[PDB]
Amino acid sequence: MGPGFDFAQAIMKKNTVIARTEKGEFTMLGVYDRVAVIPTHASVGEIIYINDVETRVLDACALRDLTDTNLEITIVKLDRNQKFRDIRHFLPRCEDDYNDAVLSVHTSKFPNMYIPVGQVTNYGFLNLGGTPTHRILMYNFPTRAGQCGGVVTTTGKVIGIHVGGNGAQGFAAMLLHSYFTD
Numbered sequence: 333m334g335p336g337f338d339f340a341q342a343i344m345k346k347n348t349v350i351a352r353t354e355k356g357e358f359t360m361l362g363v364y365d366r367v368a369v370i371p372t373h374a375s376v377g378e379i380i381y382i383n384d385v386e387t388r389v390l391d392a393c394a395l396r397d398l399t400d401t402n403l404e405i406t407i408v409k410l411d412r413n414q415k416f417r418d419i420r421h422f423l424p425r426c427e428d429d430y431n432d433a434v435l436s437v438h439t440s441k442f443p444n445m446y447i448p449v450g451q452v453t454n455y456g457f458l459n460l461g462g463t464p465t466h467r468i469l470m471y472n473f474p475t476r477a478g479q480c481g482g483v484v485t486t487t488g489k490v491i492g493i494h495v496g497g498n499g500a501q502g503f504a505a506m507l508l509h510s511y512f513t514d
């Protein structure tokens with residue numbers, strides 16, 4: 333409808349796949365080469381389905397901060413025959429608050445879904461499903477099951493991936509440029 337949705341759509345159309353694990357179907361953001369991200373609660377194993385194609389996982393890492401606190405981001409390298417567009421220049425370098433964000437989801441349950449979530453707070457600590465988690469962004473939208481892995485964008489920035497909610501608020505794990513240096 334506006335420039336926010338324009339940037340979100342451009343990311344969805346070229347930098348997402350549908351990932352399926354034994355824990356469900358997730359929106360999965362491809363960042364560069366064969367490297368993508370997914371919430372850690374997806375429990376990625378040695379094999380994952382990518383757009384319903386059996387795919388070997390070449391490498392995967394559940395990220396934690398230097399306090400050895402959960403960040404809820406898993407970085408996955410896929411044995412895929414095609415690279416992602418490199419979007420690392422859209423990643424923020426530091427922890428921040430944002431105005432006027434969009435949460436975008438693409439699964440069998442929610443195809444081509446875009447949600448204007450408004451103001452994003454650097455919330456910090458969250459007890460997420462009983463797990464102490466750091467670097468959490470919060471938005472005041474009643475997100476639902478099926479939206480985990482959804483991409484959070486502003487115009488010109490890819491700032492996080494949706495990891496949970498409490499019925500009134502939604503929570504995303506930050507994406508930082510430093511996670512994807514090679």
Ligand SMILES: O=C(N[C@@H]1CCCNC1)c1ccccc1
Pocket residue numbers: 367391392393407408409
């Ligand atoms: O850092 C990564 N993996 C190492 C090797 C073993 C797993 N944990 C640390 C990594 C990087 C890019 C994509 C995927 C994974």
